[PDB]
Amino acid sequence: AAKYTKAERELRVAKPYGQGAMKFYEKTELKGQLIIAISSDRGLCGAVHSSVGRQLKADLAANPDTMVICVGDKIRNILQRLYGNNLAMVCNDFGRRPPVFEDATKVARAVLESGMEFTNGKIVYNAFRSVVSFRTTDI
Amino acid sequence: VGSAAQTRAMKQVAGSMKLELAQYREVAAFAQFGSDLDASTQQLLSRGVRLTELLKQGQYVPMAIEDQVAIIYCGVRGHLDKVEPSKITKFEKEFSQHIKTSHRDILDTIAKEGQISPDTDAKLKKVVTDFLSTFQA
Amino acid sequence: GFEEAITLEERAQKSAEAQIMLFQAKRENVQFQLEAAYRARLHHVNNEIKKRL
Amino acid sequence: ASKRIARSSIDWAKMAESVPESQKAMYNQFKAKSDGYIRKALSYPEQPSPINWEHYRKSLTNPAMVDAFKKQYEALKVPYPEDKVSSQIDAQEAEAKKEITKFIQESRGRIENYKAELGKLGQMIPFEHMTLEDFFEAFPEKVLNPDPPSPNVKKKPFKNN
Known part of the structure; x- marks a missing residue:
């Protein structure tokens, strides 16, 4: 609850930051490879990594030839048995620290300097609908 | 024993x-956890809250069977879906008093028939709508 | 708009006609209060005699 | 002793239709205020609770005091009190009648004005085959020399500030 109170306090300001960032892609109305999966090495937080991996499994039944960049070992553990031939890279040692921009730039530099071909893509994350409800969407 | 030993109404x-x-x-x-819930499930929750508040009764005040039938009938047909659950007991006193004073012909028809007719159902729908409109509008 | 303005004036005239029944309601409201006060004393007198008994 | 038992109640339905709801929301207060006095009228009916005097006569060793109490109870039978402000209601009733007549004749005048306006619209030639001079004649807003100038002589092109 202490972590959630701190995280929601910073989410109160970092939500319009994503609204402004997504506004350009909304205005272009561009419709869709690479998949970004957001998770953490800290498990037993509920149905987060299981349902996100389940949505990722639905992507494996929709885009079987799409390389996926994971941030977290739990997504790697679930998805390696099914589609170990379609895993680009998995980030680890993440989750204990709060997410800041430097970690985002580390992932951003990883997408660029790897040189992997991608035209479209999406990011898998758990949206914050309410205190008790979270939705798995894609950006 | 069940329903074998109670009145038809x-x-x-x-x-x-x-x-x-x-x-x-x-x-x-x-x-x-139902922050977002379906309209059918919300209706079931709202009806059950009115029915739970309906069964509450003060000590040393037993009710006649005609008064019990009328109050349970109003809460089970949806007449209390607009009435707040915190005002059901006050509605129970006032609406029964209005029936016992202004619409005694309804009770005479129920007592003669032993049940509730659809014609009496329409009349009870009208006097409920008139009573809630007269209390507030 | 002229037809609606006619009907609004018709309602205004009818509300003037119902002013009389409001006055009767005020007269009955006064009589109800005087009855409830006088009859409670009649109930209180009967209770006082029962208290004496 | 007479006049108004609890059975008396005026037609609330016609009265509720007559009032303009929240414009006369004091009626919503008035009905509840009168309803509260009905609650007082609910209690204490005309006759009081009967008392079996014979039980107290037999139980008490000397029933002479019970007979004296019964005789004094029968002797003291006070009737109803006096109406106080009925004349004031009667005075306001006459004032209401004057306001009724005043409002009726004024509404009759406005009705005749609206009927004359509709008669003007009925006698007005249709706008299809109407010359521009007849449009100016039927609608005397017009334009002339002592009139507000404008590049297009419209309804409100003059001030706009």
Whole structure:
């Protein structure tokens, strides 16, 4: 609850930051490879990594030839048995620290300097609908 | 023994209330986290709250069977969906008093028939709408 | 708009006609209060005699 | 002793239709205020609770005091009190009648004005085959020399500030 109170306090300001960032892609109305999966090495937080991996499994039944960049070992553990031939890279040692921009730039530099071909893509994350409800969407 | 030893008017109405309380009991687990809930499930939750508040009764004040039938009938037909659950007991005194004073012909028809006719159902719908409009509008 | 303005004036005239029944309601409201006060004393007198008994 | 038992109640339906709801929301207060006095009228009916005097006569060793109490109870039978402000209601009733007549004749005048306006619209030639001079004649807003100038002579092109 202490972590959630701190995280929601910073989410109160970092939500319009994503609204402004997504506004350009909304205005272009561009419709869709690479998949970004957001998770953490800290498990037993509920149905987060299981349902996100389940949505990722639905992507494996929709885009079987799409390389996926994971941030977290739990997504790697679930998805390696099914589609170990379609895993680009998995980030680890993440989750204990709060997410800041430097970690985002580390992932951003990883997408660029790897040189992997991608035209479209999406990011898998758990949206914050309410205190008790979270939705798995894609950006 | 069950319904074999109760009047036709009470048995006809309490059968519906028993089903609705069972429906409210099944969906009561979804009210704990149901920030977003379906309209049918919200209606079941709202009806069950009115029915639970309906069964409350003060000590040393037993009620006649005609008063019990009328109050349970109003709460089971949806007349209390607009009435707040915190004002049901005050509605129970005032609406029954209006029936006992202004619409005694309804009770005479119920006592003669022993049940509730659809014609009396329409009349009870009208006098409920008139009573709620007269109390507030 | 002229037809609606006619009907609004018709309602205004009818509300003027119902002013009389409001006055009767005020007269009955006064009589109800005087009855409730006088009859409670009649109930209180009967209770006082029962208290004496 | 007479006049108004609890059975008396005026037609609330016609009265509720007559009032303009929240414009006369004091009626919503008035009905509840009168309803509260009905609650007082609910209690204490005309006759009081009967008392079996014979039980107290037999139980008490000397029933002479019970007979004296019964005789004094029968002797003291006070009737109803006096109406106080009935004349004031009667005075306001006459004032209401004057306001009724005043409002009726004024509404009759406005009705005749609206009927004359509709008669003007009925006698007005249709706008299809109407010359521009007849449009100016039927609608005397017009334009002339002592009139507000404008590049297009419209309804409100003059001030706009």
